[PDB]
Design a protein around this ligand. Sequence first.
Ligand SMILES: C[C@@](N)(CO)c1cccc(O)c1
Lengths: 300, 237
Amino acid sequence: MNTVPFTSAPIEVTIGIDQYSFNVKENQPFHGIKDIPIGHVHVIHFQHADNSSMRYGYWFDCRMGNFYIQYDPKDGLYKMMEERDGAKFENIVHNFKERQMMVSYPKIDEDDTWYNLTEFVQMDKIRKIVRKDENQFSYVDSSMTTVQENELSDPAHSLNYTVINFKSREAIRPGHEMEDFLDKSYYLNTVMLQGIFKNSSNYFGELQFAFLNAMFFGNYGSSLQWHAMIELICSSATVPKHMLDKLDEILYYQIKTLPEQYSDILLNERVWNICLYSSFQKNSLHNTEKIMENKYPELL
Amino acid sequence: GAMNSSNYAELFNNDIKLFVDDTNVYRVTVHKTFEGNVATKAINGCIFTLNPKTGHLFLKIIHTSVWAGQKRLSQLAKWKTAEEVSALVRSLPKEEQPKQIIVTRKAMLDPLEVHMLDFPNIAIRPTELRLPFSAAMSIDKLSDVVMKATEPQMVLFNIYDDWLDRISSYTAFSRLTLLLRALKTNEESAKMILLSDPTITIKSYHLWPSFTDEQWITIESQMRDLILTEYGRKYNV
Ligand SMILES: C[C@@](N)(CO)c1cccc(O)c1
């Protein structure tokens, strides 16, 4: 179990760690989060009490270093940093743990939610989507645009998701126009899986990361990417059976975790009705269709 | 964006553009089978591709053999249309290729866009106008070449005959759309109007009769009467 200490909490803020969140008052004696499960990526995210504009946060994996949070009064945000002095960090964490100044990562033993949401998400792949090579952790916020959004403006601050475009030469083989547009199996299996992602695990990892950025930061380009990656599978007549079974599990847990009051902006009516009721895979997502119909029948 | 009454003179500027109408590509008769079920039999169709500024009509004849052994023919017809339009554009010299293609039905947008990916600078546009180009097969010479075809064929016409010698493209298009709307609303009456006087003939190299300027005004007035009437006979007014 690992720890992300905080130097202090000078401004009132709602702090998220994965799917949990707690409120910290201005200058409250708060010094971080302990008992963080090892083996998973994690996200720690912030919404200031004064300016609910810009949710922002950091993806990290405690196996990759010792990270802590300090408030920067010049840039006006809580920053993640890496501590290179491992003896200083152990001493800092122990002192605060002794003074009971840390919240405990509040995982129920029965509860596999975070695993199920991050099963295929790897820090190394996150760091390729979010390019800031000098840090082991990745910053994301509500406003960052995607590479595909920039084509339709600061590149260093972009989300470099894999570009998916159904009306593009990459997606459409000359002479198979109708075939490839109506059945995207070529584009899914050859172009994306064999060519770009290499295996379905990396595809699912990017899909899961896009959803999590959509949910936690309200990041619109991430939501676009998540739906595009779902639609590409559902619009393929030929998909490996293990992938369809895994997609049903992935989407089930995503829909289960989605805040009900955000379903209006986080779910695209067209994509979901097409995927569940018209696509080739309309009969392959039993668990996902069942939770969608019981939790969000209005959208459908 | 979409083509409508607001931006109507755009059709007659000097940017090359084509209308594409796919209505008459997939044509069937519906009939009973010996067992009393219903079946279709295809008949020859055509793509109607028109330059509204010049009157040049690229009439691609769609022979029934295209459909042999195929499924979902109404969907295939849209993609066949887009394939043939794309092939036409590629066959034209660069300086004759259109800058815009306007489809008369929105369901042609995605098929044509996908077939024209190689041409990113050619805009594919819908229209809010309800153009009467389906009535093209009420023009006798056009119907005759489509029905006689024994194989795929492209036939070139000028749908304005020689009218542009005396009138502008705007006026020619307005005359064409009036004639076609008339033929669409009441083919028999419209055709009687056009041929009633035996002394006005259709030249061998033309589609419509050789009316004088004065006779065209009379004809046009008769077509407008027809359309307003039928719009009564229809809505009882
Ligand atoms: C305050 C300070 N920057 C130095 O002790 C700090 C706080 C928490 C964890 C650290 O590794 C370092």
